[model samples]
Every structure is written in structure tokens, then in C-alpha cells.
Target: QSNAIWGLDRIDQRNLPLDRNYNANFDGFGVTAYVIDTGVNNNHEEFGGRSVSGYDFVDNDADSSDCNGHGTHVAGTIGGSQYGVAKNVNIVGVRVLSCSGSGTTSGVISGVDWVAQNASGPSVANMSLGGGQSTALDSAVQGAIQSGVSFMLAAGNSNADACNTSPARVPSGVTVGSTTSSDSRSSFSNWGSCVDLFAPGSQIKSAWYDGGYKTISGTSMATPHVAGVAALYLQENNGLTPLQLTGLLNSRASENKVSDTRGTTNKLLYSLADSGCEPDC
Candidate 1:
């Protein structure tokens, strides 16, 4: 169950051990993740031909086939067998962006609301898209977190303060920034006190829209890594609250010196250490 994907290797370097020992014991066996982005290609082989029922906020229908390929790539990083963090978790697509890679804040809010309604215990929502600030979006994210759905959102690729963005700045969800393979903050990644952690995002490979694999880069690409790790944590802990899981993730993170102007004291996400969640439960 070793992952051949280079991104997974980067995850291992950050203490996830996803490339070697993680899946040998727990491959996110009983968790689900919601990819709230462009959409997902449910037919992709990387997903093990898993049948996923998802919603498309763009056309407002049930078809969630990815048109821009970003969602599929993100989903693959979360649960694809070869490129994933939680390789056996179920993925639910929530399409907000259209084929052009553009989506309105309202559309994103709609997708968040949908996830809030559908996701159950030990579920995560991955949002790899962000633009400006929206009170409605922030409220929706808070509501989702309140409903027991842990969210991982991109800090943005603009290289500005992530605190300037909506969900990234939102105090509820886990806001992620991007890092290079060398464990430094990516030049294109946004930073700030609002960012919760960093992950490998530059030139990472994952599943594509047409049942293939490709490399892409962005803070968007980094968010799913945290989401997938969140899935793995939930699979083991089960009934942990969003806040508790976020605390555990932060506590287990690896300390890395990042060259960024933002004054964030948060460490990089990691999952290899014991989470102290199981007391022979």
C-alpha cells in the first residue's frame, strides 16, 4: 500500500508516513471527505471505481463531473490510492467552480451548505478555492464546523496575508498555506497569523480529470493534504469535535522554519505521532 506519488512522499517527510507505514494499519477505513471545489471525476480509477454521488452548484444538478480538473486532482490527493493521504476514505464532490475555474462566493456558500447538510460524523470538507471576503461564506463555514464537519481551506496563492481572505481568515476552519518540497513557504503562497499550517504544494502530482495523472501547484493543492490527514485522524478517533481534531493536528505538527513575512507560529501538519485519542476505547 505504498504510494508512488511524489506528493505523498512530501507528506511522509512532514511526518505523515503516508508513503510507508500509515496505510499498513489505518487507511482511513471508516471516514468520508467532501471535496468542495470544481467537482470530481467519480469514474477515475484512482478512486478505485468508487461510485460517488455529488452535487453541481454551477448547473444546480446531481452531475459533479469535473470540468476544470482541479477538483479531481484535489480529490485524488485526499483519497486516491496512489496519491492520497487517506487512501481508503470515501469522497463526496461538491462542485462550486465551473469549467472556467471561476466561481462566485454565493456558489461556494451553496456548496458549503450542502456539505453541512450531508456530511456526518468524522467527515471533512476540503475547500481549495477562495477569493476576497464574504460574510456569508464565513458564516457558512462556521456553521459547518459547528455541525461537526472539519474544514481545510487554502490560504490562497496570491502571496499576501491570508487574513485578508474569507474562509481562510475565518476563525473556524483549518486554513492551510503552501510549502515547497524543501519545507519552505512557497513564493506564491499567502501567509499570515490566520494560516493554521503548511504543506507540500508546488508541482505536486495527483489524478487528473480524464483518468490520468498530472502535476499542479498552489495553496489549493496543499489544502487537500491536510483534509486527507484529517480523514485519517477521524477514522481513528471517530467522535472528536472539530476543535479537538484541529488541536490534535496542531499539537502533532512538525516544526519547520518557513521564510515568510507573516507572523504565524503554527507548525506544519503531521500525523505519525500518537494522537492520544485512544484510551482503549
Candidate 2:
């Protein structure tokens, strides 16, 4: 079984064999997180109604309700009541990918444009999808980041250099790589200096569009944990710039905790240093 029952509770603690009974309720109350993927299922109970439609580029409609399961799963991991990082973050689905979980460069650019223009206060965005290097998408991400919206992106799953992917290569957005339950980097996770941090991306459970839950893996799964935590930091550090938030996150990140970084930064995501056993218990 790839699923780790301890995925949601892994970040706050170190020196594994992980402790049970999760906690941490800073709940990103005043912030909004935009899930830029295949869209989300508003009916999924994980959101408790906080997940809603933003825009649907695939259908050219307003109903961003997820037909494919990926977007909803990412949103749930970002802020689901059960699998969430920022439990109360308001989620808006921005559908750039289609029901087949595929997308075009132009469609994704347009989606990013809408998010840049319509971002609510203390906004954060998640991009759990990627492809070959495209300057157009990277520029869109840069523009959005310039507009003060913090963006979190996934390092691709090819095990190649993360610098090989488009938005993941974009310096303005935080690029995330996947990690295992044992603090080892996931074998499929892209590496290199382009990856800013690492998170629990291997065998994680999250909400699905069918009104149930599912477990999956990938750098895609790792991206939202950082985004949710970005929303978590945003709620308290209101008005912090995207770069500032990036710095603060890196600052709070646990040092020397992750392995198999392949010479990349060894930073591991840590939420609320006061919450769990800090490299000890």
C-alpha cells in the first residue's frame, strides 16, 4: 500500500515512526486559495462548502465543478476538513485542464490571467500540473506572482531536473518536490536547485469528486501542502509579499531532515514549529 496513514500529520513532527492524533488549527481563515487544475467538486463533503467555482477554461463556462478527480483531490489536500493543511482556506477552482486532465498552453495562460485579475485578499494559487518548458506559461506565472499572489507549483514526476518543466522552473513560484514517509525523496520527484522545498507527496489520501476519498502520489500531491501552508502563513502574516512569504516559509522549514535531495536544497516543510516534536519530542 502506497498510502501512509500518517501523511497529514507528518509535517509537524520529525524523527519518524510518526506520532498519532493530529493537531494544528491555525486554519487559513481570512485567506483564499485558487486551485488551478482540472477544477473542483463543490459537492464533496471535505470542503464543507468552502470549495467553489472560479472559472472553467475547458468548457468556457463558470461551472468549474470537477469532472476529473485530480483538481478536487489537490484542493482537498490543500484545505479539506480531513486532509487539509489550512483547514479553513476558501478554495476557488480555476479549470484549465479538461475532463481528461489535459490542458493547452493558451488555456492555462488565460486561467492564470483570470486568477491574477480576480484574486481575493491574501490569495494563494496551486498548480499541480506541468509539462515541457513554455516561456508563455512561466511569464504568466511571473506576472501573477508580481501581482502579489503567492503561487505553489509541482516539480514534475519524470525524475528529471525540475528545471526542465515550465512553471515549475519559474523562479517566482515555489517549486515543490515529493518526499516519502521516511523522509527520503520520492524516486519519481524531479530534483535540482529549481526545487525550493520538499513535502509528503508519496502515497497520500485526499478527497475525490465522487463524494469519497482516494489516495495518490506525485509531486502534484506535494505542491498543495506548501500552498495550504502558504495560506496558513498568510492568515497571520497579512500583506506579506509572495517573495516575503517564500522567505518566511524557507526560514521556518526544517533543516537537515530530508535525504536523497540529489544536491538540491535540503529543506523540508514544517508547519507551526511549536506544534510537534521538533527533531526530537
Candidate 3:
């Protein structure tokens, strides 16, 4: 139920009509979300033990446990049973950022590559970390998208054009900006045409390391909402191409002022009325 946590209330604001009487039927069951960030806390109860195996490019190993809290927060938004968008989806951590919350472009690509090669089912990838534009990272994300993995990337927090950032600038990824609880763009969120949509990001509360919970901010927190929604869409209609998925999401989005600077209207990611039908259905 959306009552599990306040963040889930954003789902209703976006118009994602969850069947309160039959919540289990539409909870993103049978889909997977690959979180490409610092990593995840595999032992966190929020995941319900659904945190799958993943790689750590930082350590060059299989241990993807989160040392920096960013990834865990991102993952929790994507699939935590109590605070997530898609409570039943599997969460996979692909560690790129280190404990210090920094990483090289090469390391980020390594994590993207791992998802391209390893994700075997209906899936979406979430990249919450950002930096200067990198062609290599964009290419890797493009490859993963080509391989049937939908990507939801953050549009950076610099308040500048997102086109100047790495994965955010990647044409293949659905780059997201941040919106406050009031549906206004977060002051720190980057804007412009490169940002495909805005989602709830300000003061988001989610699972944390060592069996705790935390509230955080940034476009990093917003990207997972899109990723988790994508998982929900995929869980119902399994073979949607990346373009189809993106188009569907954009088409169903609520019009907002965030895209006004770019002469666009569909700027806020809205929710689905039904899990398996088209927007009008």
C-alpha cells in the first residue's frame, strides 16, 4: 500500500493508481532494476532479500555492498518494500562509485558493461551518479540500451544544462531532473532539453546502511522513481523496447513548467492508471 511510507504518496500524486484492495497484483512483480551507483546494502531488510548479485568495479569484485550511502538510498527508492516505487522488483547493485562517492569514467562504464552482459530478464538500469561529459560512458550506456536495458539517469545537480554531464547527456538514457514535494523543480536540479522528465527527489526518505533509514536529496534520488516506474511498466508488458518504454512514459507524463525553458510540455513523470494498459486504457 502507498501508506507504507510517505515517499510512496508521490506515486498517487503522479496518478499511479495502485489498487489498494489488491496491491499485491500490481507491485512490480517479476521485474528487475539494476542500480548503477556506489552499491547496495545487500542485508537490508527493505529489499526483502531480493538484492541480487552484482559487480563492484571499485573493488573489482562481486561484493557490491554500499559503503557510501547514495547507492543504498537509490536502491531503496527503486525496490524497498516499505519505501520503494516498485516493491516487488529485484534490485541489483552495480558498484561504480567508491566509498568516497567518487569514481573514474572508466569505472562507471565497467558497471554499465556488466549490466549489458549480465541482465537476463526484463530490466531497467538506474544511474544516479554524474560528472563531466564522457563519450566512453555514454557509449557504454548506449550499448546497454541497445541490449534491451532501459536506463534512467540523473540530470546532474549543478543547475546547469544537463547536456554537459556524462550519462545525463547520453542520448539513449531517460535523463531525469528533480522536483520538490510541491511539484516544483528542485533548486539544485539541472534543466534543459537533455532532462527528459522530473520526479520527486527532495528530502526523499529510504532505506540506509546497517538497518536504518535516511532522507536525502538530489537528482540522484529522483532517477530511481523513474527506474522503478519503468520496472512496473515492464512487469506488465514485458517486451517493450527502450524507445517504446520511453515514449510511453513521456506520453503519460503530467505537463509541468520544468520543460518550459525548452518549449516542451511533458516534463513531469506521472503514474499509470493500470499496470498493463496503454495510457488511455
Per-residue lDDT tens digits for candidate 3, residues 105-165, read 9998989999999988888999998898788888999999999999999988887899999
lDDT-wise, the better of 2 and 3 is 2
Per-residue CA lDDT of model 1 for 117-157, tens digit only, reads 98865788999988888888999999989988999999999
Any runs in candidate 1 off by more than 4 Å, and if so which?
1-3, 13-24, 275-281
C-alpha lDDT of candidate 3 relative to the true structure: 0.82
- TM-score, every prediction: 0.91, 0.94, 0.90
Query: How does model 2 score by TM-score?
Result: 0.94
Model 3: CA > 4 A from native: 2-6, 14-25, 257-266, 274-281
Poorest 10 consecutive residues by lDDT, candidate 3:
16-25
Clashing pairs in 1: none
Where does candidate 2 stray beyond 4 Å? Answer: 1-5, 273-281
- What is candidate 3's CA lDDT for residue 110? 86
